[PDB]
Design a protein around this ligand. Structure first.
Ligand SMILES: O=C(O)[C@H]1O[C@H](O[C@@H]2[C@H](O)[C@@H](O)[C@@H](O[C@@H]3[C@H](O)[C@@H](O)[C@H](O)O[C@@H]3C(=O)O)O[C@@H]2C(=O)O)[C@H](O)[C@@H](O)[C@H]1O
Length: 138
């Protein structure tokens, strides 16, 4: 396993056809997970499962620019479960990030940060045991 929070460098940023795969297990009584695709200090794509927001489970996605969070995009389909292993796949497409969990499509997030080749780090944090983090061009 890998120490959380974990930094995965994305050399030369992201580009359409690049697939980022995260494997791990949700801890018991998890509160949150976060995948933060960063352009320097900016967060181009915050992918943020929340297990207990007012007794509901929800996937929140957002962008941070100049330390200002933007308008959230929320998805109530929630494929994660405390205690269970997961796979998150983030496929970069020309106009959005496409996310699949356990091989089932979950959501898409339109690119707000336009300089894809400057989104050069993925931060992985939260209540997980992290097994692997990698990318491939498809
Ligand atoms: O429980 C609450 O309602 C909570 O609300 C605020 O915090 C929320 C949120 O829960 C925090 O996690 C944080 O979210 C930031 C960011 O602001 C948001 O736009 C982005 O999508 O996610 C971020 C993240 O995950 O870190 O801040 C939120 C906020 O409203 O400010 C209160 O700050 C907190 O005290 C609590 O009441």
């Amino acid at each position: 396993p890998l120490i959380v929070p974990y930094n995965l460098p994305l050399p030369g940023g992201v580009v359409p056809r690049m697939l980022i795969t995260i494997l791990g297990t949700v801890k018991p009584n998890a509160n949150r997970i976060a995948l933060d695709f960063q352009r320097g200090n900016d967060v181009a794509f915050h992918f943020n499962p929340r297990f207990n927001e007012n007794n509901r489970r929800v996937i929140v996605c957002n962008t941070k620019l100049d330390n200002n969070w933007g308008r959230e995009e929320r998805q109530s389909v929630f494929p994660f479960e405390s205690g269970k292993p997961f796979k998150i796949q983030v496929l970069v497409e020309p106009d959005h990030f496409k996310v699949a969990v356990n091989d089932a499509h979950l959501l898409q997030y339109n690119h707000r940060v336009k300089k894809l080749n400057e989104i050069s780090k993925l931060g992985i944090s939260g209540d997980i045991d992290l097994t692997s983090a990698s990318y491939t061009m498809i």
